[PDB]
XYZ file of C-alpha atoms in Angstrom:
165
model
C 68.910 37.269 91.820
C 70.583 35.341 88.428
C 73.817 35.141 90.191
C 72.451 32.463 91.855
C 72.434 30.394 88.817
C 75.943 31.105 88.375
C 78.476 28.191 87.717
C 82.026 30.569 87.287
C 82.908 33.553 88.320
C 83.100 34.362 84.394
C 79.718 34.812 84.497
C 79.600 37.769 86.292
C 80.291 42.132 85.397
C 81.387 43.976 87.626
C 82.678 48.134 87.772
C 86.332 48.744 87.999
C 86.969 51.377 90.369
C 87.113 54.019 87.284
C 83.131 53.358 87.536
C 83.524 51.084 84.211
C 81.930 47.312 83.435
C 84.542 44.502 83.508
C 83.277 41.491 82.211
C 85.568 38.798 84.295
C 85.495 36.721 81.538
C 88.233 38.166 80.324
C 90.290 36.369 83.372
C 89.321 33.092 81.433
C 92.824 30.948 81.514
C 94.366 33.332 84.725
C 94.556 32.346 87.938
C 92.790 34.961 90.534
C 92.616 36.259 93.948
C 89.372 37.976 94.783
C 89.760 40.067 97.923
C 87.894 42.557 99.998
C 89.814 45.854 101.053
C 89.640 49.036 102.911
C 92.062 51.099 104.179
C 91.458 52.213 107.740
C 92.152 48.401 108.667
C 95.180 47.300 111.243
C 95.871 44.956 108.420
C 96.236 47.325 105.736
C 99.572 47.420 105.121
C 100.093 43.697 105.613
C 97.628 42.776 103.086
C 98.670 46.136 100.450
C 102.401 45.314 100.454
C 102.219 41.518 100.548
C 99.271 41.336 97.516
C 102.044 44.472 95.616
C 104.709 41.266 96.047
C 102.792 38.198 95.600
C 101.154 40.208 92.236
C 104.810 41.390 91.228
C 105.729 37.507 91.393
C 103.131 35.957 90.082
C 101.424 37.937 87.449
C 103.897 37.024 84.533
C 102.394 33.398 85.425
C 98.973 34.462 84.763
C 97.880 35.754 88.367
C 95.336 38.189 88.533
C 93.985 39.753 91.783
C 90.733 41.742 91.758
C 90.723 44.029 94.798
C 86.915 45.368 95.385
C 87.058 48.228 98.218
C 84.406 47.329 101.057
C 82.976 49.805 104.145
C 81.491 47.222 106.170
C 83.686 46.561 108.272
C 84.067 49.050 110.946
C 83.769 51.803 108.275
C 87.217 51.105 107.593
C 86.495 52.421 103.595
C 84.937 55.426 104.038
C 86.743 57.366 100.923
C 85.338 57.543 97.942
C 86.552 55.429 94.556
C 88.625 58.414 93.569
C 90.308 58.520 97.175
C 90.880 54.891 97.490
C 92.587 55.120 93.908
C 94.697 57.753 95.603
C 94.797 55.896 98.807
C 96.568 52.495 96.921
C 99.131 54.419 94.717
C 101.612 54.542 97.814
C 101.424 50.919 97.335
C 102.224 50.988 93.376
C 99.288 48.409 93.014
C 99.626 47.616 89.559
C 96.509 44.562 90.188
C 92.479 45.404 89.462
C 91.020 47.419 91.933
C 87.122 48.149 91.933
C 84.820 49.949 92.854
C 83.311 49.766 96.548
C 80.710 47.240 97.110
C 79.147 45.374 99.833
C 80.154 42.240 100.621
C 77.317 40.989 102.988
C 73.923 41.379 103.341
C 70.553 41.913 100.652
C 72.472 44.682 99.026
C 76.116 43.226 98.503
C 77.172 42.871 95.097
C 76.247 39.621 93.128
C 79.631 38.050 92.387
C 80.338 37.939 96.047
C 76.919 36.805 96.971
C 78.352 33.692 94.473
C 81.634 33.407 96.242
C 80.088 32.762 99.262
C 78.170 29.700 98.596
C 80.923 28.076 96.272
C 81.497 24.466 97.950
C 84.786 25.245 98.520
C 84.174 29.530 99.398
C 81.670 28.771 101.998
C 82.958 29.373 105.311
C 81.705 27.523 108.608
C 80.836 30.453 111.199
C 78.610 31.172 107.884
C 79.424 32.077 105.082
C 79.562 35.737 105.549
C 82.461 38.043 104.708
C 84.054 38.452 108.853
C 86.167 41.360 108.164
C 88.234 43.233 105.567
C 90.689 41.359 103.821
C 89.352 37.975 103.002
C 90.511 36.141 100.115
C 89.187 33.898 97.425
C 91.689 31.558 95.107
C 89.688 31.546 92.029
C 90.824 28.544 89.246
C 91.326 29.265 84.896
C 87.748 28.014 84.953
C 86.242 30.656 87.497
C 85.494 27.872 90.359
C 86.481 28.871 93.883
C 89.026 26.271 95.171
C 89.897 27.794 98.202
C 88.748 30.692 100.649
C 91.406 32.336 102.916
C 90.132 34.590 105.969
C 91.442 38.367 106.988
C 94.146 36.616 109.251
C 95.475 34.882 106.766
C 98.565 36.953 105.373
C 98.626 37.255 101.188
C 102.109 35.484 101.082
C 100.922 32.493 102.410
C 98.315 31.866 99.379
C 101.746 30.633 97.959
C 100.913 27.857 99.392
C 98.294 26.770 97.033
C 99.328 28.298 93.618
C 101.351 25.572 92.107
C 97.961 23.661 92.003
C 96.442 25.604 89.917
C 99.080 27.658 87.589
């Protein structure tokens, strides 16, 4: 697959939660957090509340958050795209929600296959996504600059935003 040839997130297109293709080059010149989400995770509440807080705190500086539902971790995202959309409403999410995807395995979405092999997006302990709410920080040129594991509270990504704003 051609994802292997990409040098930037801006080369991918991915369906949003309504099913509509989003060309990610529209986020050129924005700092972006990409994260895999789920609704039935022990850290669902801390992640959605803190991602909303971080997005409200920094969206006027150009921060974007792209959230990808994924059911591969404990079957913790069983709902349809419509049900996930409704679920997020309780958190007042105004960042970008995407259609549910796989992030691991042969059928993972190409964007996520690409994120996992980026020099700053490689995990040791394999590149595989380990659980719900892994995060990647992506710069204004669509390069991965940091990867954060499932335990990372979204507020702790503040440490790294001045680097890239």
